[PDB]
Amino acid sequence: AQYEDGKQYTTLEKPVAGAPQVLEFFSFFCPHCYQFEEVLHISDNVKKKLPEGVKMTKYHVNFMGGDLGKDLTQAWAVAMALGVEDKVTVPLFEGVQKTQTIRSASDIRDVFINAGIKGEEYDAAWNSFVVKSLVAQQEKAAADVQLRGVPAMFVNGKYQLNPQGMDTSNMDVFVQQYADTVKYLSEK
């Protein structure tokens, strides 16, 4: 066939019930994730090809960057709760990986303040039980699929994108192939 298990995607031999339809995992410590976000705009190009009615979910993971990695997962929970994902994603990536000016929770907090989220509002979110369950969800979703690497994408809790198996000669072509694959998997 044109799309084959083990080529553009793999199948979970233990499928995850009730899973979000398009589920993406990343870490701000993750170098390919930086590329995926900044250079390739993967999430965005997948969205453009996804069907009517499909919701896209993106979660942070703990297994990179130790103590700061966990701070970052809670911070992404704050971002999701406040709906400010689109204002902190880039400065968080560049702060961790480009300028290396993020070294503590307080530095993560600075990024939000600079993006215009108010101190009171950030700190209140940070400490809220709604953010606690949001953290809980990110971990559960990762736990459910045995996740040990990022960037990672899952479709309807049964298929896992396999970017290793796509041509990287051309960045644009890699992205479309990636997005079309999510679409194919989506319609499956």
User: Cβ neighbours of residue 108 under 8 Å, at least 6 residues apart?
Assistant: 68, 71, 72, 75, 92, 95, 102
User: DSSP per residue over 123-154, as a string?
Assistant: HHHHT-HHHHHHHHHHHHHHHHTT--SSSEEE
DSSP 115: T
Query: Entry resolution in angstroms?
Result: 2.1
- Helix/strand/coil percent split, the chain, to 5: 55, 10, 35
Evaluate whether 121 touches 83 at the Cβ level (below 8 Å).
no
Whose CA is closest to 18, among 155, 153, 156, 138? 156
As a three-state string, the secondary structure of 65-113 is CHHHHHHHHHHHHHHHHHCCHHHHHHHHHHHHHHCCCCCCHHHHHHHHH
Domains of the chain by start residue, with CATH: 1-188 (3.40.30.10)
Neighbours of 70 (CB within 10 A): 17
- The experimental method behind these coordinates is X-ray
The pair of three-digit structure tokens given for residue 88, joined into one six-digit string: 């902190």
The pair of three-digit structure tokens given for residue 147, joined into one six-digit string: 């996740």
- Residue 22 is inside which H or E element, if any? strand 22-26
The rounded distance, in Å, linking the Cα atoms of 186 and 188 is: 6
